[PDB]
Nucleic acid binder design. Structure first.
Ligand code: GH3
Ligand code: CA
Ligand code: CA
Length: 1203
RNA sequence: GGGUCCAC
RNA sequence: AUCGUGGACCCA
């Protein structure tokens, strides 16, 4: 102890100084009141001194307007909480007011006019806070916008009234225009920018005026975009601010916008790792049902909430046992996850988003100082975010002489806690020291344990989902004869035993029923527990009386509501959200558990605009009811895109478009564009002419032209286009061409597998004597394959990959290709595959039927080139079901060889690399999979795998002839594993060739038959390939050009030269629009036209119905309209702050689905799930609906966004 | 899972 | 009448 404790208190609640700083400073003043104050004053500067070391990236912006003189203020601090603290507020307010009356604009004048009072706060608050920048603006009429505290703007305008400047001050706030007019721009920044960009493209080989006209064009936009004038007005994006101004014959003499912490470095912080940094210097020196508890640490930055979390972690594993950046520690009875709450807006975001709710927090104040002023905001955060419980850890107590002075701090904190309706008198306050606890000081060491004790007994145990009342969100409803109505979904809370009664509540007038049963795909069941996907059978309720969106619940347990208040986070542009602000009548979709519902909102008192990234409270009223109570999370959507997240906070009491304009566009769409001859050919020739190349002078030329693999990238680009553009056109007349050539090819491959099948089952040449590269690779590949693949396909593996999907089987036509029809209609199967079906039949109570048991698949023909089709075979359904099982296991395994058959994007980039580097080759095989013979396959794969492949393939094929083939190849295109299998065979060979040549196997990459491996390996790979029956496509393999190509991307010395194809006769406006869009994407850099192609574009644009020539959409939205500028689009309809544009759609009619088949398909899928910053988890997977395509077009409005 | 696009 | 796989956009 030292001096009277009652005296320090008098000093503190007079000065706002830390406890110990009041003590030691009162000890040297010999107990002199008005004296101690000064010793601290003169010190307040040395304090701020060491303070001004810390980065202060947070703060506020303030704004003041006197008649027609205004000023913008940027005083900032280092924390959210300080930013909204009364004291910091009052400083910033005064430092502003004082800068108004005294029209100051010199940062350093007031920066010093207050330097005195600035140490005043910095002492008290204990964060570096400095005036950053000031500026002032005068104009004839001016107006300010304040976007919370984070952005302020001053706008000076001549000719405009109150509303005008308000509105364009808001726009400046949203759209960061760095200049008032496109010409204002630094004729320098733009000068060298046009000299830099004039090569980037002139290096393509683009002729002078071509790259000149293009660069010019960009910078016309480039400047228009960063300029208030040429910006789409934020409250009216169809017209620009420029045009808006000119409509009120007014103008902006200038503007200012400051944003808190702009340009400040703003250091990243990693809490998790960060702790392990402190638990390092010290660490060196089955209860699996235990509940998980989320706790939060919150307090003053250097009061050491960090050091504590460290002390907690060490001591808690040193003694007892052993989302997103969260340390976690274990207690004999509970498991804790622990996050730091560094900022107020950050936490509110994570609470809404769900990426971190919290069961209890721990407030960390140092007894050295005591509550800070911003300590109230810490607690206030807790109150506003609804933390149920707050524990206090009093830290740094070893540095408190008088324990009567701890009695004092603990008092202030209870007093605050209670001021915010927390149970102050009753909240645990452990008095300890994190630091001495890391230094294994058994005393202070047990105080941590103590605090932990409170976490166990003070924060109550979170209700297990199973302990809650029953609720299942209905995903789909089926009517099954002789079973009744049944709903499927995942049970969210509780248990439902057959017998029990249930309400079905949500969209309609709530209804009641009883549980007739509970089933999964494998077994029937008598109850469904939380977390289980199930069907639930219901008694007496028709299936047109249930609806996705409704919930199934224990009766009275949940109610339907329409109006409620919430806290939402609006996604930033960054995070895939809106890029434009919205306003009063925002009208999006609210996605609850399993469905969207339209709803209007009302903003809070005084907020008029919302920006991507904003938290906000809003009151939401829905177009019809949804079952809900407090805590229900939801997503905000714009036609499929997720733009925000929210949680219901308190449920309340509840209570455009175009007709003969869509009709106009629909008529246009079903119009038939009509011309003379081959419109495609005409377009291709007009293109070639515009690039000064000879046209095709006949149909027969369009498919027989070879490029020159030299010349500049630009020359080559149009050459390759010319070689490819018409190469797959399906409507040439000139030609007795047929699918005859396809079947010839199909027979040639079989004949080749017949050779290699004989050769490879007889390689006793005479004697060992001679050794060969091929023989060796097969041996090398075999062994490596076995290592990757197993002796046999796991039963788990197959159980998580088998499934139906897609199109026609031997028993179903395209119409009945949906999985639900494969389950509802008996599928054919192969003699050797029958046991698989039976094993399936034995594992489920559902009927598993086979229609016929033959060894045939159906070989048909399918389009490919202008000069040949491609022979496919349609499999028996049950065989397909299992072929996909092995195809899915091979897919996974290949991931261990760096092969990823989900991402063609990795092959495209190595093709680009290869064309610049010449170290990687791209190779193609001729009849890639058709050439993989039985023999090769039998030598490479484990016998276990080979037998299974043999059970699962179709051994025979019946052709359109009626003729048969007994397959020489291991499998045909159309099989459910041929693709993954061919990928494996090719990879293993190429990898083996690498090892034999002393290259790295990892350099080998394969997507089906798109092979990429080091250029030096090619001659040896060619040799191996020849040996094993393959024939490499010398025309499509490149190991030495400037040219590469893989998975649809073509490169010439790094430049993208992938072409586009006119595949069909152009007959409808949709046909023409695709072609023109394909031209657009081919000839367009960043929305800017190569002029050579533009001319051809505008010519054929004219062949479209007129409305359709102006109906434009942004790229990335398909081809139901011309890709162009959407702001120009006259048919655009902005509705509720979301932009709807109409696109052409293929028009469909509904068809009846198969009820049992769909139900089976549903349960089967849920069975699959179970066998195998993130909030997108707020969505599902959709009901089976069947539809037939009529041959007409429809018009669909869709949600759109400038970019 | 459909329609479309682009690919293996 | 149009097999298997992947990716994107719209639907759903
Ligand atoms: N089931 C199926 N597989 C395909 C299809 N297209 C390509 N593939 C698969 O990927 C491999 C690549 O085929 P392609 O390179 O286009 O043709 P190819 O059979 O090897 O013949 P070629 O190069 O001589 O034209 C072969 C085949 O397994 C297809 O349309 N259906
Ligand atoms: Ca090929
Ligand atoms: Ca290829």
């Amino acid at each position: 102890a030292e001096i009277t404790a009652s005296l320090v208190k008098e000093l503190r609640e007079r000065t706002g100084a830390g406890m110990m700083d009041c003590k030691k400073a009162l000890t040297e003043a010999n107990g002199d009141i008005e004296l101690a104050i000064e010793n601290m004053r003169k010190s307040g500067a040395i304090k701020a001194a060491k303070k001004a070391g810390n980065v202060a990236a947070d703060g506020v912006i303030k704004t003041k307007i006197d008649g027609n003189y205004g000023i913008i203020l940027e005083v900032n601090c280092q924390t959210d909480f300080v930013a909204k603290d009364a004291g910091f507020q009052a400083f910033a307010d005064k430092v502003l007011d004082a800068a108004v009356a005294g029209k100051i604009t010199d940062v350093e004048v007031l920066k010093a006019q207050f330097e005195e009072e600035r140490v005043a706060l910095v002492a008290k608050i204990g964060e570096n806070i400095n005036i950053r920048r000031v500026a002032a603006l005068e104009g004839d009429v001016l107006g300010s916008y304040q976007h919370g505290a984070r952005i302020g703007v001053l706008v000076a305008a001549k000719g405009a009234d109150e509303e005008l400047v308000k509105h364009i001050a808001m726009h400046v706030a949203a759209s960061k225009p760095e200049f008032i007019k496109p010409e204002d721009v630094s004729a320098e920044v733009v000068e060298k920018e046009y000299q830099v960009q004039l090569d980037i493209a002139m290096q393509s080989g683009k002729p002078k005026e071509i790259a000149e006209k293009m660069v010019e064009g960009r910078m016309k936009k480039f400047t228009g975009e960063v300029s208030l004038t040429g910006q789409p007005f934020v409250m009216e994006p169809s017209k620009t601010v420029g045009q808006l101004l000119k409509e009120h014959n007014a103008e902006v003499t200038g503007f200012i916008r400051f944003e808190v912490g702009e340009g400040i470095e703003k250091v990243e912080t990693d809490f998790a790792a960060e702790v392990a940094a402190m638990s390092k210097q010290s660490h060196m020196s089955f209860e699996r049902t235990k509940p998980h508890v989320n706790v939060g640490t919150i307090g003053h930055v250097d009061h050491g909430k960090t050091t504590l979390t460290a002390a907690i972690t060490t001591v808690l594993a040193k003694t007892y046992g052993g989302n997103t950046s969260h340390v976690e520690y274990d207690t004999p009875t509970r498991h804790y996850a622990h996050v730091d709450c560094p900022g107020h807006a950050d936490y509110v975001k994570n609470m809404i988003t769900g990426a971190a709710q919290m069961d209890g927090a721990i407030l960390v104040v140092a007894a050295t100082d005591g509550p800070m002023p911003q300590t109230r905001e810490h607690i206030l955060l807790g109150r506003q975010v609804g933390v149920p419980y707050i524990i206090v850890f009093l830290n740094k107590c070893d540095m408190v002489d008088d324990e009567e002075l701890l009695e004092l701090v603990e008092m202030e904190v209870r007093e605050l806690l209670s001021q915010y309706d927390f149970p102050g008198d009753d909240t645990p306050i452990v008095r300890g020291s994190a630091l001495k606890a890391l230094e294994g000081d058994a005393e202070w060491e047990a105080k941590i344990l103590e605090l932990a004790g409170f976490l166990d007994s003070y924060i109550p145990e979170p209700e297990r989902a199973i302990d809650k009342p029953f609720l299942l969100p209905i995903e789909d409803v089926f009517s099954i004869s002789g079973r009744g109505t049944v709903v499927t979904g995942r049970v969210e809370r509780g248990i439902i035993k057959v017998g029990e009664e249930v309400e079905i509540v949500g969209i309609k007038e709530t209804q009641k029923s009883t549980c007739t049963g509970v089933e999964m795909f494998r077994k029937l069941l008598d109850e469904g527990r939380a977390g289980e996907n199930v069907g639930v059978l219901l008694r007496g309720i028709k299936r047109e009386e249930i609806e996705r969106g409704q919930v199934l619940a224990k009766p009275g347990t949940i109610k339907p509501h329409t109006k409620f208040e919430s806290e939402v986070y609006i996604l930033s542009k960054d995070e895939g959200g809106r890029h434009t602000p919205f306003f009063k009548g925002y009208r999006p979709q609210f996605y609850f558990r399993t469905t969207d519902v339209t709803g209007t909102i009302e903003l809070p008192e005084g907020v008029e605009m919302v920006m991507p990234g904003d938290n906000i409270k809003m009151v939401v009223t829905l177009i019809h009811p949804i079952a809900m109570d407090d805590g229900l999370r939801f997503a905000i959507r714009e036609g499929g895109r997720t733009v925000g997240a929210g949680v219901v906070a308190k449920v309340l009491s509840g209570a455009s478009s175009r007709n003969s304009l869509s009709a106009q566009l629909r008529r246009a769409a079903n119009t038939r564009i009509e011309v003379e001859g081959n419109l495609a050919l005409s377009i291709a020739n007009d293109l070639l002419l515009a690039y000064g190349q000879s046209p095709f002078n006949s149909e027969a030329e369009c498919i027989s032209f070879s490029p020159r693999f030299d010349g500049t990238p630009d020359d080559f680009r149009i050459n390759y286009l010319k070689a490819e553009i018409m190469s797959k056109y399906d409507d040439f007349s000139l030609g007795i061409d047929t699918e005859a050539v396809a079947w010839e090819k199909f027979l040639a491959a079989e004949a080749e597998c017949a050779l290699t099948n004989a050769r490879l089952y007889r390689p006793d040449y005479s004697e060992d004597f001679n050794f060969s590269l091929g023989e060796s690779c097969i041996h090398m590949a075999r062994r490596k394959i076995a290592k990757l693949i197993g002796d046999v396909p796991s039963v788990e593996g197959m159980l998580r990959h088998c499934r139906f999907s897609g199109g026609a089987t031997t028993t179903n036509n395209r119409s009945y290709g949906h999985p639900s029809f494969k389950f509802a209609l008996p599928q054919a199967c192969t003699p050797r595959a029958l046991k698989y079906v039976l094993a399936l039949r034995a594992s489920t109570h559902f009927d598993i039927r086979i229609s016929d048991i033959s060894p045939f698949n159906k070989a048909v023909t399918v389009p490919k080139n202008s000069k040949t089709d491609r022979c496919i075979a349609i499999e028996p359904g049950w065989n397909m079901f299992f072929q996909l099982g092995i195809g899915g296991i091979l897919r996974d395994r290949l991931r261990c060889w760096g092969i990823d058959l989900n991402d063609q994007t990795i092959n495209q980039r190595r093709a680009h690399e290869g064309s610049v580097t010449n170290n990687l080759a791209t190779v193609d095989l001729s009849a890639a999979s058709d050439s993989i013979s039985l023999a090769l396959c039998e030598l490479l794969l484990p016998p276990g795998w080979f037998e299974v492949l043999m059970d699962l393939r179709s051994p025979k094929g019946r052709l359109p002839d009626g003729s048969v083939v007994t397959y020489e190849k291991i499998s045909s295109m159309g099989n459910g594993y041929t693709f993954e299998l061919e990928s494996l065979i090719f990879a293993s060979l190429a990898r083996s060739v690498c090892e034999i040549l002393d290259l790295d196997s990892s350099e080998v990459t394969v997507y089906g038959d798109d092979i990429i491996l080091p250029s030096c390996a090619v001659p040896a790979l060619r040799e191996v390939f020849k040996y094993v029956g393959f024939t490499t496509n010398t025309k499509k393999t490149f190991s030495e050009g400037p040219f590469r190509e893989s998975c649809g991307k073509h490169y010439y010395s790094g430049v993208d030269v992938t072409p586009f194809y006119i595949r069909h006769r152009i007959v409808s406006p949709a046909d023409l629009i695709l072609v023109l869009n394909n031209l657009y994407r081919w000839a367009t850099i960043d929305g800017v036209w190569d002029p050579r192609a533009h001319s051809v574009y505008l010519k054929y644009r004219k062949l479209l119905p007129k409305q359709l020539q102006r109906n434009t959409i942004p790229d990335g939205y398909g081809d139901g309209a011309l890709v162009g500028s959407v702001l120009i689009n006259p048919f655009a309809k902005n509705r509720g702050w979301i932009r709807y544009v109409p696109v052409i759609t293929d028009h469909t009619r509904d068809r009846e689905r198969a009820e049992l088949g769909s139900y089976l398909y549903d349960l089967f899928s849920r069975c699959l799930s179970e066998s195998n910053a993130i909030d997108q988890l707020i969505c599902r997977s959709n009901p089976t609906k069947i539809s037939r395509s009529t041959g007409k077009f429809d018009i669909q409005y869709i949600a759109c966004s400038s970019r």
